[PDB]
Amino acid sequence: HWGYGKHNGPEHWHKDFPIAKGERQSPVDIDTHTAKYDPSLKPLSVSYDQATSLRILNNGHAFNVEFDDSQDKAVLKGGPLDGTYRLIQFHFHWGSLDGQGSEHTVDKKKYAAELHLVHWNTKYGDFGKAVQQPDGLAVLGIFLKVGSAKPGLQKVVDVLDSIKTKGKSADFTNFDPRGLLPESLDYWTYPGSLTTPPLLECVTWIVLKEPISVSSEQVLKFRKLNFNGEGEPEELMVDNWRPAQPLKNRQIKASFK
Ligand SMILES: NS(=O)(=O)c1ccc(C(=O)N2CCc3cc(O)c(O)cc3[C@@H]2c2ccccc2)cc1
Ligand SMILES: [Zn+2]
Numbered sequence: 001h002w003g004y005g006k007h008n009g010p011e012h013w014h015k016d017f018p019i020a021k022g023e024r025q026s027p028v029d030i031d032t033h034t035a036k037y038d039p040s041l042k043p044l045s046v047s048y049d050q051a052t053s054l055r056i057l058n059n060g061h062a063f064n065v066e067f068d069d070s071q072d073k074a075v076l077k078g079g080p081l082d083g084t085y086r087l088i089q090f091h092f093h094w095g096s097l098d099g100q101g102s103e104h105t106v107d108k109k110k111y112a113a114e115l116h117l118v119h120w121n122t123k124y125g126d127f128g129k130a131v132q133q134p135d136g137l138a139v140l141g142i143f144l145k146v147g148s149a150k151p152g153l154q155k156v157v158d159v160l161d162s163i164k165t166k167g168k169s170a171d172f173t174n175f176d177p178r179g180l181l182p183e184s185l186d187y188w189t190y191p192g193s194l195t196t197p198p199l200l201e202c203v204t205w206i207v208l209k210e211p212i213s214v215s216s217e218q219v220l221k222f223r224k225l226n227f228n229g230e231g232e233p234e235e236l237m238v239d240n241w242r243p244a245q246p247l248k249n250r251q252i253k254a255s256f257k
């Protein structure tokens with residue numbers, strides 16, 4: 001029954017998921033002055049040319065655009081990663097206002113939203129097994145700021161009306177996730193966790209330095225989605241982000257400078 005409301009939000013999650021107060025929780029604040037350039041980091045490899053999107057789903061806490069991951073098509077490798085990670089889905093976290101919405105922060109700055117492209121390590125066979133491993137997932141995070149529209153995001157924005165409430169899904173084939181990437185692949189990386197329950201500590205986070213720009217109309221449409229299901233009191237899907245967690249015994253490494 002976890003959610004983002006006053007009575008079931010992030011501050012309550014620890015009661016059902018004690019790992020919420022663990023040693024490598026996400027998101028975190030990225031202190032750009034403390035992050036250290038790591039020359040041993042190999043270049044990041046995002047191969048989405050053969051990506052196969054299938055459906056978009058409103059699951060009550062965000063909307064996921066799901067991909068066919070039964071074959072090695074859209075994969076992430078290189079950077080801090082050893083092995084190949086297959087793209088399974090992407091979703092966003094956003095706010096009720098342009099001044100908040102991202103999960104990670106940069107020098108405490110909050111962006112209007114944050115895109116997460118979730119990938120699982122093929123050496124574990126499937127996603128369910130991968131989430132039980134410390135290096136099971138790789139999530140590529142991309143910040144969104146409000147300004148000019150993102151052409152590549154419009155197809156997602158226009159299908160949202162068809163999945164307004166929890167449990168609704170719609171066919172979403174042939175969507176190219178390459179259209180959601182910034183120009184530069186410079187990034188920060190650190191070991192962490194899923195940012196939603198079960199908050200498993202199975203993620204290598206790779207967060208891009210360069211935000212993409214989306215228009216006020218694009219994010220405005222995100223804020224029209226609902227957390228509730230059809231026929232229930234309307235709860236707008238906004239502020240579905242978890243705040244920054246203690247960094248603890250971790251170092252954030254930079255791929256640049
Ligand atoms: N924000 S994030 O760290 O990038 C992230 C990653 C994966 C997942 C995910 O795949 N989850 C967690 C939430 C969730 C909620 C459901 O209703 C559900 O049907 C599945 C999930 C999955 C999940 C569930 C159990 C164990 C691991 C993942 C969600 C968010
Ligand atoms: Zn996420």
